[PDB]
């Protein structure tokens, strides 16, 4: 299902140039423009906000994925706690970018938010672990990358928004 994302291991040049080279390699492999999305990020001292595919959000410091609410359904509750859990610190960096799909797959790269930020990538699959099959895709796409590190021996499971831990880890690495 929702495969775990991967940190931008490849970092040897300009982030813009890196994204350009990644898109060029994707086009050389052969794909189509599957639209563009965004990956929000706002922490509260913990709960990292975000929204993606569609009208639903997540924010959780450390919990078993309590998400079944949309953007407004959670924003209203957040604003209601103006003194209980209102910990809106400095705005966390958030990436975005387009999305492509070779076949039964999807790819999505990130960009910097303030400029000294990362350019991580995200990929998923259509099966339910299939961690071996998805690897060869990136192996043929780029060099040594995609460690994966899924939650093995658990069936969290299916990785619902579990990538947020690695996201916050990369965000703290600044």
């Amino acid at each position: 299902v929702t495969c775990v994302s991967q940190m931008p291991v490849a970092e040897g040049k300009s982030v813009q140039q890196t994204v350009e080279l990644l898109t060029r390699k994707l086009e050389m492999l052969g794909a189509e423009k599957q639209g563009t999305f965004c990956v929000d990020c706002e922490t509260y001292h913990g709960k990292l906000m975000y929204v993606m595919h569609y009208p639903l959000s997540c924010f959780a410091l450390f919990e078993n994925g309590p998400c079944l609410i949309a953007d407004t359904n959670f924003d209203v509750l957040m604003v209601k706690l103006k003194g209980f859990f209102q910990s809106a610190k400095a705005s966390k960096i958030e990436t975005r970018g387009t999305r492509y799909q070779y076949c039964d797959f999807l790819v999505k790269v990130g960009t910097v938010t303030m400029g000294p930020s990362a350019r991580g990538i995200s990929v998923e699959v259509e099966y339910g672990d299939c961690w071996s099959l998805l690897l060869e895709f990136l192996q043929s796409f780029l060099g040594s990358h995609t460690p994966g590190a899924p939650a093995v021996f658990g069936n969290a499971v299916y990785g619902p928004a579990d990538t947020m831990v690695q996201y916050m880890e990369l965000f703290n690495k600044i």
Binding site: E126, Y127, E136
Partner: protein, 270 residues
Amino acid sequence: SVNLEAFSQAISAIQALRSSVSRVFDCLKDGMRNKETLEGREKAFIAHFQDNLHSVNRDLNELERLSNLVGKPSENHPLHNSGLLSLDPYSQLLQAYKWSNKLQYHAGLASGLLNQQSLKRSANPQYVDDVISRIDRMFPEMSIHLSRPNGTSAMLLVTLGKVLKVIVVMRSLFIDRTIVKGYNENVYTEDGKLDIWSKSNYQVFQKVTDHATTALLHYQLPQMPDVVVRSFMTWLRSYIKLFQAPCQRCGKFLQDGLPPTWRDFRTLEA
């Protein structure tokens, strides 16, 4: 309890060892028949020496295996045969056992080889379906169900390790008009209003559906629908892994599978 094969192997091994040492000793009774060029008989000598080493190694390997036999031999079953001659007419029992086994093996081999028939042509009940479903449902890890909301025709589905269930709606005896889906993408419980068909997927399992349709037009035996559906479900079960991909690497395409001969390989290549 399949140690009988290893024990027969050990029997053959010791027989071959005896035969080899006898032949080696017999060949040493005379030298080169007519060499006229050299003493190359040393080659055959070293070959026999290595054959002896092979025999010793096989004996050792078989000693390593065949750990031990279980206590209380014969498991108290032939105690009647072990009984006195009063009740034993007992050997007749073993004779009939051997005869039955031999006849069974013979009939099986004959039926198997008779697959290539010579019949140039073939010319001059809502109770078997439930029985067949009950028989097939005794199999493990493959749960089935049926509701049949359309009518006399049969409507059923099967489940696997994942949620990649398969919707198979066919006639009374033979399987036809099937479709495949994956991970609740069909939701054919009360889809819209009831167990809907919708004949669709998200453009990935179309290949699997085509393969299953082709298989349905391939395992269509003239009679014996039970064997037909058994072959069908065995064919279906071969996709429980979808990980390996011989005759290629596991990166050729979306997926790799087409085992109509009980063996999968990279698709789009046959």
